[PDB]
Amino acid sequence: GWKKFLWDSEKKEFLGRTGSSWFKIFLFYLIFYGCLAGIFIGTIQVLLLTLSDFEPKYQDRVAPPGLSHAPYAIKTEISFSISNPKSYESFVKSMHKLMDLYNESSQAGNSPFEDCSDTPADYIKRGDLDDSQGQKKACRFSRMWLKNCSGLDDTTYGYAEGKPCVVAKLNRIIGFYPKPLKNTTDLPEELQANYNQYVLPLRCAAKREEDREKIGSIEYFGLGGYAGFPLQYYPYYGKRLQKKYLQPLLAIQFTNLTQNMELRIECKVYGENIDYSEKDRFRGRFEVKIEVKS
């Protein structure tokens, strides 16, 4: 059994067949699998044909834009010691990776960057989503706009003395026009002051009513000094039609933060085409657990 079914010397069989059986079966499987592969490849080439290069056919799974930030938190928590330097390195490294793309050296010349209004403005349409006109032009976004969180003055960005920053960003969507709430009698409390129509407001607060007192002064930095995103950086024409495109950013300094205590801070954007979800905690808003233990 054990030995025979492995190699016999009378019928010159290996594993059960001779060289002509093993050969017939191997050849059959080779031809069969070859045809299978060729058919799958053809059906994939026709797939490469059926779609357009300048626009995703379905854009419903990304209708309400998200709200991400610069630091990379494992569980949406920012905990670091003001003494041990090897504690906030993972944060600064990320922050730096994000801001390293807004370097002025990258943004230079007429092509493909264009100087835009230093003060929030309205939308700008560079035509349709076609290849007629060459690569569209995107507005320039300078680093310095973010005042105390830019890594140009205090590389660490704040984490060095108990005053961390948080660079918020709106998820890039093709053909998405941000629309802010109007001045009518119905509007949140916060939003009343500084109603620049052209700015999408971002405002952070405390998850629980208690934590309010323990959170100090939320100082936002942005384009024009407002706490929002200028409508002029929209819409986004997609990578193919707008490579070298920069999305606005908003810096948030959590000055006067109580020491040695977990603080739950929820940031939220307001607007018409913006809707939150009880399942996705990153749709329009975001949560951060800061704890500057020193």
Binding site: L36, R61, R240, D280
Partner: protein, 993 residues
């Protein structure tokens, strides 16, 4: 249970006296024991019943069913689920409870499968316990001087026990007084020899002496008394039963087949598991990811729904058999019939109709024919000789049957007669041409009668003589013509008497061979006038000693009877010869008749010849011809009584058409044990207890149902309700039919395993998002595929099954490599490709092109990366991409169903084409419709994203698997074509299951 003390030869205290034994047991020879003493001993020694030995307790076998192959794998699955939950609960906060639910569910599946299988075996056990249908019995013990019939279990050592011809010995006794008592020690001596039990001692060996009765035997005739020396597990039959019962029964063929594939399945499961686990840690995978892998792979490989499908399939075919007159006691006997190649049947009541009418009669050296027609429209037989009158008196007197009360209206032939068919046929013929038998019987009072004996082979009785001038006694007896011929010396010719010279003896042999050649059963009738001088009118001839002259009788004449054959009998014999089943006519009928019935039924094919036939055709002695030139042969019972084992082996090894006549159903067992020895499955057909040791050791025991006794039916494996022989053929056909369907269903279920295994494999080799989750798998093997696999059983035959030879167990199997090459090698591959196609399509339409999917897994699964760039530059959060992956799982499952359509259609037939067989199976059509409705329901029903994680699909996706399905259909269609045109070629020895 000391075996060595049980292996030793039995010892005893037989060589003693009547005084020395009562003292040993404290009893009275004329008064027995006292009730108080009897109960004191009943409590001291225990009951007279087989003490429950290693028996299976209720919880023991239930817990056994909980641990068996698929349950161990599912158990390790539940364990893994709880391990991953523990890890999550100790490593992260807010741990979703999905894994704990999946584990509790797996454990529930294991517990329920058990419950179902146990319930089925319990159902069979109950219907099995419901067979003793007439009335139980007890023993006759004498206590305090009174006779009482008490429960046999209540018999103790020392009391007095009385037995009577027909009752079973309740325990081992020491005979104290007997009256012509005879016992049948068939269980210890192996012979149906009627040993007489005498109070005196006769042999040093306890098994040979007569002063000892043994449990497991019966008192054939007479009455006796005796003291109880052994009771319970201590009796002879107690040592036989308790130590021989321990012997295991065995594992039926279908069980061995289910084991062979569990072995193969486990082989590929461990090969993929241990290997990918080592690979997972060779690539840097953490523990909480590798555990999820391991689980997914184990579930993917295990067909969680197969065994239950098999159990159902078999239950359906058992219901079909219960509807076609063939009832099967043990579920697996359904298949044993198909694998049969040797049958030991009987001739009366199977091949024949058992209705019966007298046909010919011998008297005055002349054959006479009687009218055997319903309305009695024919020729009389010359009722003018005295011989006929004497014959009428013999038959009308030596017969115990009588017309059933209240038949004064029906005709003489259609009335009901309570009794055997021979006595009934004789009674009808006498009542037909001899007037009222009731007056003929009251005209001669029967004094003493000795009924037919299976050993004596004769019925005798001494009645008074109606002769007013001759106040003597008449003796009549009937029986086998040879035995009766050996018991006479005169012949009643035309009335007068004459000697039995060889001239009439040869005329009797030729007449006997004439009636036998006619396929009729002949009987001999003789009588004698007892001399009133040696046996006066007052002397009583008690049936104990030789009170009547056995020999020197006056033979009057032979009497035949036409039991006819059945409709399908010639056809059934032809079907058996066409298949290759060696039929053996075993009948208590005569060889002289057997050769005629054999030529009339087929056993002796038109052309074959026996050694005597050749010697007769060449008018030469029989010792000159060579036994190789004779295809058939008629073996006599006496020559069977004097035959060795090897001789029987050669008899069955060198002859294709054997017929056993003048056979006592004991010898039967010997022939059965000789048929199994050569290496062939054996079936048997029985009616009584002599067949019990033959039906138990035969691969399949077919017992009759109407004429059969409780013992014979309760000890057999298959019961017949119409007592016909065509039912045996029907059982074999259904056993084959349910086999080819199991093959088809297995290939079906297996084929879908590849599209479930490949996504995981690509997930590890190519690093692409998970294509098919585990819940979707369980929703495929436990959902949409169950109904179609169940429907595959209702498939009709393709060619003629009752024509091919029985399958070889050592070479042909149920799951070979050809099936693996088809399901795992070709069809499954196409199904997997179709699933991947739909997958890539769903991802390409949402923004993730195939070039950017390779290498994204690390970040596609990262729960903290809310910015995943796609092929167009869009940023996707974690939950959004997860929603897309789930929609890809839903479409993959639907693609599986789409390809399963063509797989169920190509699996419907194994060789024939679809345009030939036809889609007449309504169950299969219903299966397809339901299979589609279930997938649509699981996807479109609201709230399915909270329970099963399945999102709705867009109407353009549902058409991504259609080309693959049609391709599968065309490929298998051309496959099942070269096989038909090229028999024995490559496509047949490579893909013909």
């Amino acid at each position: 249970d000391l075996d060595e003390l049980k292996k030793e030869v039995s010892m005893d205290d037989h060589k003693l006296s009547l005084d020395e034994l009562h003292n040993k047991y404290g009893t009275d020879l004329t008064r027995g024991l006292t009730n108080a003493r009897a109960k004191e001993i009943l409590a001291r020694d225990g009951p007279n019943s087989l003490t429950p030995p290693p028996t299976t307790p209720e919880w023991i076998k239930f817990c056994r069913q909980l641990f068996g192959g698929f349950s161990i794998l599912l158990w390790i699955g539940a364990i893994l689920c709880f391990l991953a939950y523990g890890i999550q609960a100790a490593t992260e906060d807010e741990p979703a409870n999905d894994n704990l639910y999946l584990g509790v569910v797996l454990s529930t599946v294991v517990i329920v499968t058990g419950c179902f299988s146990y319930y089925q075996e319990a159902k069979s056990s109950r219907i099995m316990d419901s067979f003793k249908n007439m009335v139980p019995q007890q023993a006759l013990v004498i206590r305090d001087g009174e006779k009482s019939t008490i429960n046999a279990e209540f018999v103790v050592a020392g009391d007095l026990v009385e037995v009577k011809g027909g009752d079973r010995i309740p325990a081992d006794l020491r005979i104290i007084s007997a009256h012509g008592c005879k016992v049948d020690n068939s269980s210890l001596t192996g012979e149906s020899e009627p040993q007489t039990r005498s109070p005196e001692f006769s042999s040093e060996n306890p098994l040979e002496t007569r002063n000892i009765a043994f449990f497991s035997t019966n008192c054939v005739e007479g009455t006796a008394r005796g003291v109880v020396v052994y009771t319970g597990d201590r009796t002879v039959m107690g040592r036989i039963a308790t130590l021989a019962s321990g012997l295991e029964v065995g594992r039926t063929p279908i069980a061995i087949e289910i084991e062979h594939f569990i072995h193969i399945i486990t082989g590929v499961a461990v090969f993929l598991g241990v290997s990918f686990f080592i690979l997972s840690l060779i690539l840097g995978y953490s523990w909480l990811e590798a555990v999820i892998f391991l689980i997914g792979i184990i579930v993917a490989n295990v067909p969680e729904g197969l065994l239950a499908t098999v159990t159902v399939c078999l239950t359906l075919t058992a219901k079909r058999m219960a509807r076609k007159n063939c009832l099967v006691k043990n579920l697996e006997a359904v298949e044993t019939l198909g694998s049969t190649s040797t049958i030991c049947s009987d001739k009366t009541g199977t091949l024949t109709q058992n209705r019966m009418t007298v046909a010919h009669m011998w008297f005055d050296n002349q054959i006479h024919e009687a009218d055997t027609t319903e309305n009695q429209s024919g020729a009389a037989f010359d009722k003018t000789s005295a011989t006929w009158s004497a014959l009428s008196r013999i038959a009308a007197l030596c017969n115990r049957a009588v017309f059933q009360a209240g038949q004064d209206n029906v005709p003489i032939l259609k009335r009901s007669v309570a009794g055997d068919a021979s006595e009934s046929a004789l009674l009808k013929c006498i009542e037909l041409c001899c007037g009222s038998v009731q007056g003929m019987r009251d005209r001669n009072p029967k004094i003493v009668e000795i009924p037919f004996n299976s050993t004596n082979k004769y019925q005798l009785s001494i009645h008074e003589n109606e002769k007013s001038s001759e106040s003597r006694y008449l003796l009549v007896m009937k029986g086998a013509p040879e035995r009766i011929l050996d018991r006479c010396s005169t012949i009643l010719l035309n009335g007068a008497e004459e000697p039995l010279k060889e001239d009439m003896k040869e005329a009797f042999q030729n007449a006997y061979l004439e009636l036998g050649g006619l396929g009729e059963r002949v009987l001999g009738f003789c009588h004698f006038a007892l001399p009133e001088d040696k046996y006066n009118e007052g002397y009583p001839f008690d049936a104990d000693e030789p009170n009547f002259p056995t020999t020197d009788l006056c033979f009057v004449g032979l009497m035949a009877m036409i039991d006819p054959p059945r409709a399908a009998v010639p056809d059934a014999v032809g079907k058996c010869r066409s298949a290759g089943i060696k039929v053996i006519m075993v009948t208590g009928d005569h060889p002289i008749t057997a050769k005629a019935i054999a030529k009339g039924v087929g056993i002796i094919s038109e052309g074959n010849e026996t050694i005597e036939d050749i010697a007769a055709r060449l008018n030469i002695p029989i010792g000159q011809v060579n036994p190789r030139d004779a295809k058939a042969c008629v073996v006599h019972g006496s020559d069977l009584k004097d035959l060795s084992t090897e001789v029987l082996d050669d008899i069955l090894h060198y002859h294709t058409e054997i017929v056993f006549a003048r056979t006592s159903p004991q010898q039967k067992l010997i022939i059965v044990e000789g048929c199994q020895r050569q290496g062939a499955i054996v079936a048997v057909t029985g009616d009584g207890v002599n067949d019990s040791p033959a039906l138990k050791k035969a691969d399949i025991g077919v017992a009759m149902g109407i004429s059969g006794s409780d013992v014979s039916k309760q000890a057999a494996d298959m019961i017949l309700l119409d007592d016909n022989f065509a039912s045996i053929v029907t059982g074999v056909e259904e056993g084959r039919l349910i086999f080819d369907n199991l093959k088809k269903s297995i290939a079906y279920t297996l084929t879908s395993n590849i599209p479930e295994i490949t996504p995981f494999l690509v997930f590890i080799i190519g690093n692409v998002p998970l294509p098919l989750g585990t819940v979707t798998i369980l929703c495929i093997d436990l959902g949409t595929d169950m109904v179609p696999a169940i429907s595959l059983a209702y498939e009709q035959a393709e060619s003629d099954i009752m024509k091919r030879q029985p399958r070889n167990p050592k070479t042909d199997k149920l799951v070979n490599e050809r099936l693996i090459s088809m399901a795992y090698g070709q069809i499954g591959m196409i199904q997997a490709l179709g699933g991947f196609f739909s997958y890539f399509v769903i991802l390409a339409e949402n923004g993730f092109l195939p070039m950017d999917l390779i290498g994204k897994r690390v970040r596609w699964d990262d729960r903290w990366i809310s910015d995943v760039e796609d092929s167009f530059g869009q940023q996707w959060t974690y939950e959004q991409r997860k929603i897309v992956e789930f929609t890809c799982h839903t479409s993959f499952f639907i693609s599986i169903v789409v390809v399963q359509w063509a797989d169920l259609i190509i699996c419907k037939t194994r060789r024939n084409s679809i345009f030939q067989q036809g889609m007449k199976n309504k169950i299969l059509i219903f299966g397809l419709f339901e299979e589609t409705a279930l997938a649509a329901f699981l996807s479109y029903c609201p709230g399915t994203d909270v329970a099963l994680r399945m999102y709705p699909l867009k109407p353009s996706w549902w058409f991504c698997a259609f080309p693959y399905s049609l391709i599968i259909f065309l490929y298998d269609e051309m496959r099942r074509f070269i096989i038909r045109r090229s028999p024995g070629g490559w496509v047949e020895q490579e893909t013909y299951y």
